[PDB]
């Protein structure tokens, strides 16, 4: 115990951890279906000083 | 294509002043839209089974 | 094995030796002390494995 106390002074925690190579997200991205919708020139009207 | 052509005509009538070193956003978007239009039609022509 | 363990785990061997040497005695309970001892390379009067 005396010997270990003497060398303990010269030590500090070696912050090492262990994880997985790949960690998937909790919720995988949902496949969004394609739906055709016409060009709309009003979608920016509420951004900044818009003009209706 | 139709919307782009209509917008291109409106810009002709409005006789817009363009200078990349002044109205950067206006000029950049104007050139970007034309090139997109151009490359789109070129790309389309490469789809040999479109007919 | 015994010499190797006394070198790597002296503190464990120290307790194993003292524990085996100073037993009273029942047999079934002695085989348990002997099985532990022999696993540390300690020579036993009765061989548990045998």
């Amino acid at each position: 115990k005396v010997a270990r106390r003497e060398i303990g002074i010269l030590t500090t925690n070696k912050n090492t951890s262990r994880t997985h190579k790949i960690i998937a997200p909790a919720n995988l991205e949902r496949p969004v279906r394609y739906i055709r919708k016409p060009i709309d020139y009003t979608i920016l009207d509420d951004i900044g000083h818009g003009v209706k | 294509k139709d919307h782009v052509c209509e917008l291109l005509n409106t810009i002709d009538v409005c006789q817009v002043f363009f200078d990349i070193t002044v109205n950067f956003d206006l000029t950049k978007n104007y050139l970007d839209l034309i090139i997109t239009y151009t490359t789109l039609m070129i790309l389309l022509s490469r789809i040999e089974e479109r007919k | 094995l015994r010499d190797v363990l006394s070198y790597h785990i002296p503190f464990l061997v120290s307790s194993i030796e003292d524990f085996k040497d100073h037993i009273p005695t029942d047999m079934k309970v002695a085989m348990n002390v002997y099985e532990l001892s022999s696993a540390a390379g300690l020579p036993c009067e009765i061989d548990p494995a045998l």
Partner: protein, 601 residues
């Protein structure tokens, strides 16, 4: 800009004959590339297509000659011109990234250099990428850049600096906006003699939004949104650029220039992420996968470049940036592609480090073998009746490169890359590079230990425990050093590998050294004792071969003496040695069973 000029002047070709500037500009671009990118990997060969259009017109004979002169200029000089640019940018970005990392505060005043650098490098990469795949080579080295990884790596360095010291850039430019900019802007607005209400409302809005900013908000880490302010400047450009506009921008060029500077400042606050995508996105590699992987291999096989091999899996994070909401059908395919590539890259980086370590272990095992007593026989004889380990380490000149030098350098270089970043997120999946190495080290070590046993059933051959232990210890020494290069716990690696070897089967149901030696001592050594060829010498504390007429291929004493059995105990420990005895007692049970028959009889 190059696509603008090339396609643009073709669409208003008339100006090419009446304006010298337009022509010179057009020709300059025609000399810079041989093909353009329509979209992704779809390319457009300029000169051929351009000529075909002008040959079918009239007053453009002089333009046809321009195209042909530019075509040869590009084909002959453009390639080398870009090559030299990539060399310059490698030095430039390297020094830039390093200086910034030393003084992160410089990311404030020098923010522009970061995005200039990224843009320049990005352009050169995409230019090389499409010309390499579409242009025939004059020489074997045409369009080949074996140092491409370095350029990409330092792009990532700059990207990482912006992500890490964002708040530093945010703070610096909210002060710039609320201080200098707000003053000069307001000063300029007040001096305008004419401006409709709409124009006035917007410009005043700029000032009020700018003066309402404070470093306090950055310290709180608020989420700024200047999209409205940026679109209003876009609107104001439209309102003041149309002819007969009350307030004409052509008469107030300084307003436009000042406003552009201010807009850039707002992006430095709330658009650092999007600015990275705009100036340095390389999702284009997703559509040049063949070249992507090729550039990777080249990087690994070149020690000086393998250092930057981490850049490739890092690029896999870019892939999602090439997707559009109007085409969700491709998004998942591109996603799976980035995950598959990132995993392959990290796996291959780990396997090469593994191989390098293996070769080093082999080298060290040789050095340890040279220390064994057997090699001193000569020295004994030469003294009875009448080189040196360490000589290999006596270096005269570093220019003299040993095999160990090469292996050591290749290892440190590659490990720098494996240890560069703790982890990376690709399509919401977290990858941890060092875990690839750890896994391969455990697997390889297990294979090497069993392999160094030199076991052979047919020939009844097996390694001397003392020599197996010697090699294993050499292995452990080399592996232990790996902690110098990679934030990895080699102790756990040791525990997993060695402790399983004390069992009759490892975690994979495979034979261990415990099972191998146990079988050999029984089916070979002890069996030949019963055959009368070997005897136990209590005098020597070992089993020794007898001078009989036999065909033994081993010396019992070299497998069963005090040093050997101790070496064996080192390898098998309590678990293994206990398993050994159990097998012994079984054979004894068999003998006792037969003895009882003789007693009953």
């Amino acid at each position: 800009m190059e696509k603008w000029i090339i396609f643009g002047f073709i669409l208003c070709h008339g100006i090419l004959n009446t304006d010298a500037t337009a022509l010179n500009l057009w020709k300059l671009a025609l000399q810079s590339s041989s093909c353009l990118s329509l979209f992704r990997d779809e390319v457009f060969h300029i000169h051929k297509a351009a000529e075909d259009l002008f040959v079918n017109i009239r007053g453009y004979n002089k333009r046809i000659n321009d195209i042909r002169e530019c075509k040869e200029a590009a084909v002959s000089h453009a390639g080398s011109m870009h090559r030299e640019r990539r060399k310059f940018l490698r030095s430039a970005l390297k020094e830039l990234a390093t200086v910034l990392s030393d003084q992160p505060g410089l990311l404030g005043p020098k923010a522009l250099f970061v995005f200039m650098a990224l843009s320049f490098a990005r352009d050169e990469i995409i230019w090389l990428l499409r010309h390499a795949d579409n242009m025939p080579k004059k020489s074997a080295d045409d369009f080949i850049d074996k140092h491409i990884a370095e350029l990409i790596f330092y792009m990532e360095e700059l990207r990482a600096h912006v992500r890490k010291y964002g708040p530093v850039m945010q703070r610096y430019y909210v002060q710039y906006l609320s201080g200098f900019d707000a003053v000069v802007l307001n000063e300029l607005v007040q001096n305008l003699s004419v401006c409709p209400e709409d124009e006035s409302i917007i410009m005043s809005s700029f000032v009020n939004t700018m003066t309402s900013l404070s470093v306090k908000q950055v310290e709180d880490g608020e989420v700024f949104d200047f999209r409205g302010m940026r679109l209003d400047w876009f609107r104001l450009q439209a309102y003041t650029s149309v002819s007969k506009a009350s307030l004409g921008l052509a008469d107030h060029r300084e307003l436009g220039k000042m406003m552009n500077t201010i807009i850039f400042h707002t992006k430095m606050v709330d658009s650092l992420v999007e600015m990275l995508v705009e100036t340095s996105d390389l999702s284009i590699f997703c559509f040049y996968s063949r070249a992507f992987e090729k550039m990777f291999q080249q990087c690994l096989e070149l020690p000086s470049q393998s250092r930057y091999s981490i850049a490739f899996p890092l690029l896999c994070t870019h892939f999602m940036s090439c997707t559009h909401e109007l085409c969700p059908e491709e998004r998942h395919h591109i996603g799976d592609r980035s995950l598959s590539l990132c995993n392959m890259f990290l796996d291959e980086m780990a396997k090469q480090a593994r191989n390098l370590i293996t070769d080093i272990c082999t080298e060290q095992c040789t050095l340890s073998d040279q220390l064994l007593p057997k090699h001193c026989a000569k020295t004994i004889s030469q003294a009875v009746n009448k080189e040196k380990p360490g000589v290999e380490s006596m270096r005269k000149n570093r220019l003299v490169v040993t095999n160990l030098d090469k292996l050591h350098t290749a290892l440190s270089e590659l490990c720098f890359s494996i240890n560069y970043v703790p982890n990376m997120v690709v399509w919401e999946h977290t990858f941890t590079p060092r875990e690839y190495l750890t896994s391969h080290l455990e697997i390889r070590f297990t294979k090497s230990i069993v392999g160094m046993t030199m076991y052979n059933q047919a020939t009844q051959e097996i390694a001397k425990p003392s020599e197996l232990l010697t090699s294993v210890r050499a292995y452990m020494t080399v592996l232990q050093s790996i902690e110098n290069y990679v934030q990895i716990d080699i102790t756990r690696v040791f525990n997993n590998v060695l402790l399983q070897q004390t069992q009759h089967l490892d975690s994979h149901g495979e034979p261990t050294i415990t099972s191998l030696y146990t079988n050999w001592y029984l089916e070979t050594l002890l069996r030949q004792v019963s055959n009368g060829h070997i005897a136990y010498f209590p005098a020597m504390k070992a089993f020794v071969n007898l001078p009989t007429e036999n065909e033994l291929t081993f010396n019992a004493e070299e497998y069963s003496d005090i040093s050997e059995m101790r070496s064996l105990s080192e390898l098998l420990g309590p678990y293994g040695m206990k398993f050994l005895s159990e097998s012994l007692m079984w054979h004894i049970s068999s003998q006792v069973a037969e003895l009882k028959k003789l007693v009953v009889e």
